Amino acid sequence: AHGNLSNADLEALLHPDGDTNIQTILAPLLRPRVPGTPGSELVRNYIIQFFNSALPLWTTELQVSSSKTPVSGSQRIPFVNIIAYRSPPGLNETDVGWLTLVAHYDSLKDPEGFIGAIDSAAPCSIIMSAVRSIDAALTRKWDNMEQYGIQVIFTDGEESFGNTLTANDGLYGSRSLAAHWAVDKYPSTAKYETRLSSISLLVLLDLLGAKNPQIASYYPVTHFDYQRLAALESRLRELGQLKSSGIHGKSWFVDRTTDVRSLKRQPVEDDQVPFSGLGVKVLHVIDADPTTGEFPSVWHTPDDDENHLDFDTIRDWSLLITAFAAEWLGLQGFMDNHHHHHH
Amino acid sequence: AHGNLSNADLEALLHPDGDTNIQTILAPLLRPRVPGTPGSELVRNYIIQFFNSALPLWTTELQVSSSKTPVSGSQRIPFVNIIAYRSPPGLNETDVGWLTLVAHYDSLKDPEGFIGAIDSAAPCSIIMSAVRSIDAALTRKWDNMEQYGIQVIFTDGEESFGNTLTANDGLYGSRSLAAHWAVDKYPSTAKYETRLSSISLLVLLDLLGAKNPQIASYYPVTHFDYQRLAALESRLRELGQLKSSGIHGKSWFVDRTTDVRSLKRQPVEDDQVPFSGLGVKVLHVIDADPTTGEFPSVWHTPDDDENHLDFDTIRDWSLLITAFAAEWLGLQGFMDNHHHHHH
Ligand SMILES: [Zn+2]
Numbered sequence A, B: 001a002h003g004n005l006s007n008a009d010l011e012a013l014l015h016p017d018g019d020t021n022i023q024t025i026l027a028p029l030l031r032p033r034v035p036g037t038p039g040s041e042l043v044r045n046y047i048i049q050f051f052n053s054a055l056p057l058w059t060t061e062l063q064v065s066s067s068k069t070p071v072s073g074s075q076r077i078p079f080v081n082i083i084a085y086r087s088p089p090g091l092n093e094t095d096v097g098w099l100t101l102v103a104h105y106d107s108l109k110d111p112e113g114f115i116g117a118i119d120s121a122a123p124c125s126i127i128m129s130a131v132r133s134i135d136a137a138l139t140r141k142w143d144n145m146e147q148y149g150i151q152v153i154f155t156d157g158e159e160s161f162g163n164t165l166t167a168n169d170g171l172y173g174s175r176s177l178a179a180h181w182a183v184d185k186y187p188s189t190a191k192y193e194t195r196l197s198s199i200s201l202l203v204l205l206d207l208l209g210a211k212n213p214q215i216a217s218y219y220p221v222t223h224f225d226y227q228r229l230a231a232l233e234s235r236l237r238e239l240g241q242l243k244s245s246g247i248h249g250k251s252w253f254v255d256r257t258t259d260v261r262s263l264k265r266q267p268v269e270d271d272q273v274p275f276s277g278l279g280v281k282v283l284h285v286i287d288a289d290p291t292t293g294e295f296p297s298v299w300h301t302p303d304d305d306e307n308h309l310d311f312d313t314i315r316d317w318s319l320l321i322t323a324f325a326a327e328w329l330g331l332q333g334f335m336d337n338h339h340h341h342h343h
């Protein structure tokens, strides 16, 4: 489901805490975080603690598996997906449809020390920042009260390990989660049948934080959601709320005028593929040239670091995803973050 | 794994029983077979009985689920996948990798009476005919004796039911099977980890039986298998063993010279998608214009019936898939079907 945001709603998107900004949320992610390593545990527990302190009404959960990789020999490498969710009160969680926002928090193993600032530390911080901004509005609109909640998934083991293309290499966390949630059966009485079927919309963020991204629409079934996202971007650009673009900047959403039945782009293999293959509606927000399909220039090089991040672009992304989630959840009229007893 | 077929091996592909031909195997399939209907049970039990009588060394199994559809209201429609397999003797089945050949045996529900002769009755008969031809050779080569078996899957509920594009509509049987086999854990001691992981190669046949098919390569990870299939076709055409093409006929395999890293085609959503999303190597043999992506003209019309089937093309397909399976299983030198004590 979804609502419609007034221009006023769009001018009240930022969260009231100016001291906790995206650079602040991003910084502890910008470290090597290969699966199974100490850096993975440090980043994972940073994310969990962020939700536990700043978003205490959310429930956090981990989904754990292990798998051999092309470089692990006989040893199983563990993959730990991080799930956080918040549902409306006095609703059976098994009756809730979830807007589900996703990014991978693991980092590539080769070269040693690889940071992956756009891949996907910055996507992770965009999600974290955005759900922080909408949590206050969700509390307001649920205090006034429909059967939809909000969910984030930070996936482990997205990145492949082997030198050569191998079908079961990569997407370790997303394959395990989809596979497990597809067999997590609800009661017969519940509105939804499985934990997987309760995903109303899966939005996967990947390779964001570079300047001038190009975002194609890859799934007809979510092209309308794509067009809603592009509209919010356009409106924000007009109202001048975008820092990385002037009022006449080019739109990132190259397929925005394309007809759903005219969409002819090959999907990019990534974490949405296991979910999409089992029938989940997925929207894949990934920066990639729409024609060739080639990723940003820093992709999988040492230059994918903090110094090459565009923080104005990252702030625009956070605002855009906040606006998209607020529209989808129908938070129109509940975005005011002015503080009472303060002039 | 795989072997190499001599020109002699290619001249001995047909099965010794001339009275059981593809028209014979195909005919009982060419009837309405909507999931949950009496026609579905009649076709399903025809297939099971075919394996049980003509291929008695194979084990047959059914995977059963049920699901609501856009047109079933509150009622669950059952979906019954048919599995048959044969593994080398004195091998733990849990240590076997499977060449897995697939087609859907359900038929479209609208319009009433739809036959789907290419979609996919003829694919089903191609598989049935081919594994019949290679079963005798498998017995010969296993009597002489490596860790690979042969498997067929006739999927139910491929076809979608709703008027409008819907993510969880369609692929009912393939989603359930992949989902269940992905959680079917073998013993720790077994060479393979799950029933899904034991699939070495999944070859999906769809929309075959029309003249002059065009078959693109859709998955880099199986492009070499694709090129092996195209080679066998070319060699067969040269040796004049192909009935639908002269020695200078055009090849069906349009991507045969294309470099694996130059493959830029959007996959066709179909039964291989759930498996591919969970890491199975899939080769998708489907007739479709390589550019537009549009299916044969009879697709989903009443003209997709027996009268529009090209039986020479169907016989060529059966020979080609027999040759491909025999190469993959390394049956070179074991294809002679001459009969002892007969001049
Ligand atoms: Zn990467």
Ligand SMILES: [Zn+2]
Pocket (backbone or CB within 6 Å): B108, B116, B119, B159, B300
């Ligand atoms: Zn069809």
